[PDB]
């Protein structure tokens, strides 16, 4: 379970139902709290944008794997010890967790900076939890909210009102993926 890179051709193409997606958000939270108790340091909880009902695809793995490398190089850059790291596939698709012995805020700012500066940064959902279980946000620091993959507006406004077509979100993912993996 320690190992972290998810081989893309072994993707499950598991079609997740709506109530299976709604159930897994509760297992996530519970799993997140077990890591915080086993290692009381901030935790990065990392999933990939996976718009459809099939969220464990070859595309989503290649994207998850690029994030793994970048999370580790960020840890090394900031001089932050990873105490535990694991990956899995859940109802939200590829998922990773890293217990990092760092200040929670620095960690959240670093991962914000990563989502912006990295060529694939907008396919990553890099959450950061404090040991108390508080999920840190851009709003805690009066930062602009995460913007939508497809236009200028905030992600939440475009996801609430299904503004953008699912094929467009997917085609963008392939497109960003192909501009990097050149």
Which residues are near Zn ion by CB under 5 A? 148, 150-151, 153, 158
Q: How far is the CB of 50 from Zn ion (least distance, A)?
A: 17
Contact 44, 107 (CB under 8 A): yes
Contact 109, 141 (CB under 8 A): yes
Structure tokens at 161: 């009102």
Which residue, 70 or 148, is less far from Zn ion as judged by CB? 148
Structure tokens at 22: 């709604």
Which residue, 128 or 169, is less far from Zn ion as judged by CB? 169
- Nearest 10 degrees: Cα torsion 41, 116, 182, 5: 10
Give whole-number Cα distances, 29 to 12, 35, 74, 124, 149, in Å. 23, 10, 24, 18, 25
Tell me which residue has its CB nearest to Zn ion.
148
Q: How far is the CB of 150 from Zn ion (least distance, A)?
A: 4
Which residue, 135 or 155, is less far from Zn ion as judged by CB? 155
Q: Which of 94, 96, 73 has its CA nearest to residue 86?
A: 96
Q: How far is the CB of 168 from Zn ion (least distance, A)?
A: 10
Which residue, 152 or 181, is less far from Zn ion as judged by CB? 152
Q: How far is the CB of 23 from Zn ion (least distance, A)?
A: 28
Q: How far is the CB of 162 from Zn ion (least distance, A)?
A: 10
* Cα(82)–Cα(156) distance, integer angstroms: 31
Which residue, 81 or 153, is less far from Zn ion as judged by CB? 153
């Amino acid at each position: 379970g320690s190992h972290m890179h998810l081989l893309p051709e072994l993707a499950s193409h598991h079609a997740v139902s709506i109530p299976e997606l709604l159930v897994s958000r509760d297992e996530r939270q519970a799993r997140q709290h077990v890591w915080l108790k086993r290692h009381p340091v901030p935790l990065v909880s990392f999933t990939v944008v996976a718009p459809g009902p099939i969220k464990d695809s070859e595309v989503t793995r290649r994207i998850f794997n690029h994030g793994v490398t970048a999370l580790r190089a960020l840890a090394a850059k900031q001089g932050w010890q990873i105490q535990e790291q694991a990956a899995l596939v859940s109802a939200s698709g590829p998922e990773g967790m890293l217990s990092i012995a760092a200040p929670a805020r620095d960690l959240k700012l670093a991962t914000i900076e990563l989502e912006h500066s990295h060529p694939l940064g907008r396919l990553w959902d890099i959450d950061v939890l404090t040991p108390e279980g508080e999920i840190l946000s851009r709003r805690d620091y009066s930062l602009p909210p995460r913007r939508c993959l497809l236009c200028e507006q905030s992600a939440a406004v475009c996801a609430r009102g299904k503004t953008h077509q699912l094929t467009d979100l997917l085609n963008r993912m392939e497109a960003l993926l192909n501009d990097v993996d050149a």
